[PDB]
Design a protein around this ligand. Structure first.
Ligand SMILES: CCc1c(C(=O)NC)[nH]c(C)c1C(C)=O
Length: 165
């Protein structure tokens, strides 16, 4: 199971880890991808997860989009986890670098409540432009299921833990 995590609350745990490496090690039931509405996994966590699947995640995602159309900002879809997890929950947090409503971050985290346990990144953090301290606060105030947060950057991980209220 998950190891080396710091417990933040009853159900939220955090670790300084590469989510790709964490997924390959644990093979969780659900890994969360920091997806965009088109499921175009170009960079950040999405590019890293997709590259770990040898692009199988992108091939599956393009078929999903061709059939269903784009996701909503704040929405999600469950696809295969490929070599990383049983499933991948592609969650679309608002991209503040695209001027998207930061208020949609709570709706994005609500998707996690449909899964008993998840390995996840902080939504809308990194290349999505939101404040990761704000993302962690929305996560602990929204997610009720067991979420194991992987934070890639050690310096950000320390800032998140040291400032956690
Ligand atoms: C492609 C770079 C990458 C990897 C990786 O390739 N791990 C094996 N994991 C992560 C989380 C990244 C990021 C944040 O972009």
């Amino acid at each position: 199971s998950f190891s080396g995590y710091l417990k933040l609350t009853d159900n939220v745990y955090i670790k300084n880890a590469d989510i790709v490496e964490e997924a390959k090690k644990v093979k969780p039931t659900v890994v969360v991808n920091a997806a965009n509405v088109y499921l175009k996994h170009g960079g950040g966590v999405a590019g890293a997860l997709n590259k770990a699947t040898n692009n199988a995640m992108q091939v599956e995602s393009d078929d999903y989009i061709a059939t269903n159309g784009p996701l909503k900002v704040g929405g999600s879809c469950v696809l295969s986890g490929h070599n990383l997890a049983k499933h991948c929950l592609h969650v679309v947090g608002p991209n503040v670098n695209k001027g998207e409503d930061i208020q949609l971050l709570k709706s994005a985290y609500e998707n996690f409540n449909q899964h008993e346990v998840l390995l996840a990144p902080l939504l809308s953090a990194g290349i999505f432009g939101a404040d990761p301290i704000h993302s962690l606060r929305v996560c602990v105030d929204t997610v009720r299921t067991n979420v194991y947060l992987a934070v890639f950057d050690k310096n950000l991980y320390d800032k998140l833990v040291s400032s956690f209220l």
